[PDB]
Amino acid sequence: GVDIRHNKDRKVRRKEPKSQDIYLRLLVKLYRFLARRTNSTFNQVVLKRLFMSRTNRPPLSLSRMIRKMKLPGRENKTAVVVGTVTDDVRVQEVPKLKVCALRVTSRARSRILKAGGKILTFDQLALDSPKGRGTVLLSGPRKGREVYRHFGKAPGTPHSHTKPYVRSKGRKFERARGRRASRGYKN
């Protein structure tokens, strides 16, 4: 026979989006062609991010966009998020941005267009720059979700800063034996 071990024989990654959306599948039908038929890997990574799940393409906010676009060198470039460009209310002035996203929330659309910016979709991005040149590809904070505070080294183990699953935060709800130094032990 052959003594190859078939555990990791199959790659796990996606080849099609799980969504049954039709506009997203048209964007996939376009970027399949562009990444197959160009030699710029912006197209490969942007179809790889069109495929993803909405917990893997987190919402990038407009404060991150303003900061990471005002970092020096990248003036009049095109910000590209594959997720959802959301408003961030704790920022006052907004510079002229040139952004491209699947879906921009309504107050962020109003904010950028009052600042004098321009919103694009991905079909217009492919017309405007097919190899994706002149673009800054950004992604949202992926471990910004509240779930990742429950992950890692478990609570009740030394040097583990993990939020434990408790039904209501209070005085009585798991503050006593693993936590105190008088009540039992402190981990």
* Site residues (vs another protein, CB under 8 A): 19-27, 29-30, 33-34, 37-39, 89-90, 92, 102-104, 106, 109, 121-124, 126-128, 130-131, 150, 154-157, 164-167, 171-172, 174-180, 183-184, 187
C-alpha to C-alpha distance for 117 and 124, rounded to whole angstroms: 15
- State the binding string over 45-74 for RNA (x if CB under 7 A, else -): x------xxxxx-xx-x-xx--xx--xxxx
CA distances from 85 to 1, 21, 61, 112 (A): 54, 19, 5, 11
CB of 92 to RNA, least distance (A): 10
CB of 92 to another protein, least distance (A): 5
C-alpha to C-alpha distance for 103 and 122, rounded to whole angstroms: 10
Name which of another protein, RNA, none residue 13 binds, using a CB cut-off of 5 to 8 Å depending on partner kind.
Answer: none
C-alpha to C-alpha distance for 29 and 47, rounded to whole angstroms: 10
**Does 118 sit near RNA (CB under 7 A)?**
no
Q: How many CB atoms lie within 10 A of CB 128?
A: 14
**Does 142 sit near RNA (CB under 7 A)?**
yes
